[model samples]
Target: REPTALATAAAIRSGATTARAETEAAIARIEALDGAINAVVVRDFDRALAAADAADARIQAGDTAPLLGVPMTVKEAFDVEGLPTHNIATSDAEAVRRLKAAGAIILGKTNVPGGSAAALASGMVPLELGSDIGGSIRIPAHFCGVWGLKPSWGAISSHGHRNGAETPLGVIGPMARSPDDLAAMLDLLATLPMPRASRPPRRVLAITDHPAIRTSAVCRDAVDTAAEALAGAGIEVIRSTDLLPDLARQHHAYGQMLSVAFARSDPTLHASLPNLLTWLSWQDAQARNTRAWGRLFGEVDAVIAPPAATQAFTLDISPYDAHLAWAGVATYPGLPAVVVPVGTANGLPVGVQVITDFHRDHDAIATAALIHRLTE
Candidate 1:
């Protein structure tokens, strides 16, 4: 296991190690292990080492940035100077600047296929910057046996990402081996200071069935395990409830909206794009569904569900067709959700998504962390 971002920074601050040491160790690990995994798509080890040296100088001068000296990587989708990622812009994206400002040292960019997360799981880095439009962040975290947060829509800025017109479905978030690193990344990446949530969830609803698809047995069991853990911890766990929105309908609306959003870039979809009235109806459905979920949150503190339809590809089996329904659980409603690995099935990891009310990003993370404690 890797020392989490928080622990890495703590060690650096206490003089146990310098940023250069951490950066070199991470670079060495990647150099030795990445040939087989191919997770690190871009390399900037020399620049990273120089950055670490600068970090050490600041630390010696009494600087105490939260992630100072923490070695990590960003998704290839972001534009990082001197990195083979973009032009598109000449400077770092807003999110990347924030992380750098907090003293994080970026080794390079990872492949869009959860490279940051793969880096974290392989112990190459303690932190990962990721983007989610559907399951990119959450599913990879689930498969990699890590924690990932898909914060409420607009909770984090989309400036540095591939967000064109800023689709409601996409958001940037953090992935890590532990919830503490997840929380720490959020503090540094959030567009504005977020309110810290203090209380653990009072009541949680666990739903394993989706109208569009049936969750795999192992995934459902993961939800059961999480709900049981929360219940054991004295929180009310409701297995069934009607206060929830019509997920099948919500999922349908989500699909339509997503299709229309992507149609802008697809040549074939141009002719099939919906008319103005059809677009309005989709927007209307989203509004109604958001309100419906809002009402459910009035009675329940959070909802626990599978992050994906099945365990991460034990035999290289893909659940691609069945995943959107699960992603829509929180995405459709524009709610904040966190995926925490609850347990394993067939030696592969399964994760539970903790969905909280809109803008309750902290609550979602805290609730997931509490359940994480139980599993540990």
Candidate 2:
């Protein structure tokens, strides 16, 4: 996150950080600090070195690229050829292809791995690639304090990611320390140029609390900070029961549908499909929830809520959960949501998700961008 992708590119172009220098500094940092926390596992430095040399040579010859010579890593889960998921895949995912074409160099794969917002937050790398189903992308972003997007389902191809498109809840998006880098990376995947400075739409709804799960005071304050910022900017911020979706009801339906992908209600039964009537019922309920949200969007440009019920929690394997409560609200309907760091409390990071109607991705991201500026 030290030098954002755009900043790094600018530096390289301005005769500042050479691609080879950038790559070497990244290599040195990983060796210097990675021993403390194993953020990276497998590596591709030799070829990356060669690639960096080539990129530097190209820049010297007056060539430029979107992310040319940037050094970074992706989550270990993605299928970037020669990068393994315990086992190697034959080709790269569409996200990887688009990034490579944009000139972003892959340093290695984070054994967990953005482009990785976590790495950006920690200053090990500037940008990363990652996928999300529920909060896979946003969860890490919120905890680590970086920008991430869960593009509308199918908005970006979901190849090489598992069980995602199958249920219509999975999405792949980019993450970076700066929302500007986040915006540029998303547009690259979206195959379109995102309007860089879109205004925060005229109206927004803030959810300071939800019945299904209570947010920590820090998180609630984060929402208030963002809501107040927009209102001060001449945007109307309203909080009314009528403007929000029914969280308890939405999570119930979303839970039922998402669980179907796992074993059935009766574990005695095989990991099978829901019956015809059950499938129909789930579909009907999903459509109803989707419509309910569509109605909310009719009244406001975006809805803001804590990305999770709690600010990033310490690792635990215990049995209880409320993450599904807020997370699945947008997932069940495949509505797009973007997470932006509002501020932190108790020395922990707090982030809020900006929810918008399906395909209203830019508006949600732009709104979050405004919130990010408030924190800055």
Candidate 3:
């Protein structure tokens, strides 16, 4: 297993290990594992190793940066200077500039579903980008057994990330082998003038089912595990009487909003009648559910739920294609969602989605980190 970036940095900082050694080990492990997993679409062995060497030099020179000498991977949708940030569409320029500024050694892009659409789902789909949304990132992290965080919208800088400038849902996050590493990245980004802060414990509600999407036993268990973990951590896990209104309606609502958003931004692609109709109906249903869920949020600090109804899928299956309904459970509410790996079901990883009240991004992350530690 790859040490989380935080653990690797700590080891390097305390002279327990050297950046050079860690990078070399990572390269060797990837070489051995990438063939079967295909999670890492691109690799930068030479440059990353060189960067590792430089990080060692910096450590030797008494540099104490948070992520100094850490190795990380970015979603293909985010630009990394000279590297290509396809985002399943065309190449982007801004992604390159932003990533370079962050001081992250560009190890190359991970996969995502093409067009970043719901139908391009990862975990279920086998496409290079896996699923258009964060599924590409999610599936890879699960399969590779690493840490991945899809922050609430706007928590991370999306300046250089791909998927058309008009897209609102797509955001950039971190992927690593350990939760501490994920927390480290979040800390670095948190310092960069964003709307995120660590607040006191707030009301946490657990929702295991929705009308439009089915919640598998595995998914429910993940939710229950998270709830139990939170309670153990001294965070109140609330069980409100408010239940999700209707599944089919919520599904239709999500589809409609997605369609309208896509059509408004990319009209030329709206020629597909079947897709357009599907989008409209889903959006309508999602609107209703959103209003209902929004009311529930008034009584809670954040909502803890399952990331997906099922575990990661084989490459041949198209689970990523189920984005329309899957996303509705989380996206329709438009709250900031932080997905944390809780445990595995039937040998596949399952994640818990913690949805915070709008703008409580850091709290969501802190809660996720706490819950993650418990399961670990």
Candidate 4:
């Protein structure tokens, strides 16, 4: 396996390795695996190596960029100067600009088509930048056995993204092999100064059951595994709470709004559009849902739930609409949710979702990190 983005940067800072060396190694890994996985759609090895040499030069000059010398990739939807895209951008996007300025070398761009998660799973990259509107980030991490965070809506800038900013629920967040990487990447991506809340979460609500979807027994077990780990570590874990929002209602509103949001641009789905008054009513429901969740977070620091209803499934079948309920649990409220791989069920990876109040992105990441450490 490749060293994590943070570890790679640390290694270069301490003169343990050069950026050129890391870039070459990453290129070799992708070349060996891309045949079977086909995750990387566009390769920029020559420019990446050149940029790596520049990064090494900067490192030798006593520069300490956060992601200095870290080799990584971006989804094809992001604008990378020379990458091929339907919407060709001649410049780097805001997030991409930040990453490059921090000395991270981009080996290539990946297809939006689960290539980000697949590359992370295959050890081709240590960190990924993915967007989630209705489970694009968390579900892939759940399926690929990696870590992902769906940051509070608008926490990270959506500029340079192709379709994420189209809806209120869409958010650009980080995916990685470890929670520590998630935290580091979030720092680089955030548009505003998002600090950790004054108090870390000591109380968590363990919610394995949802009113809208039937969580499979395996997924329920994954939630139990996480709750047990947290309780054994002395964190207060409760099964029931009165302050919880109505998930069925939330999912209903989410489904309605998501359908409208996605269809507003397509001619075929135009018939799905609702009347103006009806759309306004749905928006009101969203506000009510957000306020309800805010009230719940006043007593409980975080909520522990299943990342999905079941483990990875075949492409022949699409259970996305039903499975999306789990992801929608956090999205509807615009909260920070971190999904960490806990253990396996039926030979597949299982993940636990830790959702925190808005702007407490670090809290969610820290709790999820603790779960990751405890499970390991």
Q: Which candidate is the best by TM-score?
A: 1
Per model, state how many residue pairs clash: 0, 6, 26, 0
Q: What's model 2's overall lDDT? A: 0.77
Worst 10 residues of 1 by lDDT: 315-324
Rank order by lDDT, top first?
A: 4, 1, 2, 3
lDDT of 1 by residue, 1-376 (tens): 7788999999999999999999999999999999888898888899999999999999999999999999999899888875666444577878899999999999998998768778988899998888886688999999888889998888888785773566768888999988888888888888787779868888989998887887789988888888888899899998777888878777777887777767876688799899999888787878788888889999999999988887766887322334678888788778888999887779887889999988888888999999988977
Q: After superposition, how far is residue 46 of candidate 1 from its true place, in Å?
A: 1.4
Would you list the C-alpha lDDT of every candidate in the order shown? Answer: 0.86, 0.77, 0.57, 0.86
Q: Count clashing pairs, candidate 2.
A: 6
Between candidates 1 and 2, the one scoring higher on lDDT is 1
Task: Give the clashing residue pairs of candidate 4, or none.
Answer: none
Candidate No. with top lDDT = 4
Off-target runs (Cα >4 Å) in candidate 2 are 113-115, 163-166, 191-199, 241-243, 264-273, 314-321
Provide the TM-score for each candidate, comma-separated: 0.95, 0.90, 0.74, 0.94
Q: Residue-wise lDDT of candidate 4 within 337-358, one digit each (tens)?
A: 9999987778888898999888
Worst 10 residues of 2 by lDDT: 191-200
lDDT of 1 at 169: 80
Residue 232 error, candidate 3, Å: 5.6
Off by over 4 Å in 3: 85-102, 113-146, 190-202, 229-250, 260-268, 272-295, 314-326, 374-376
Candidate 1 regions off by >4 Å? 86-88, 314-321
Please report how far candidate 4 places residue 176 from its true position, in Å.
0.9
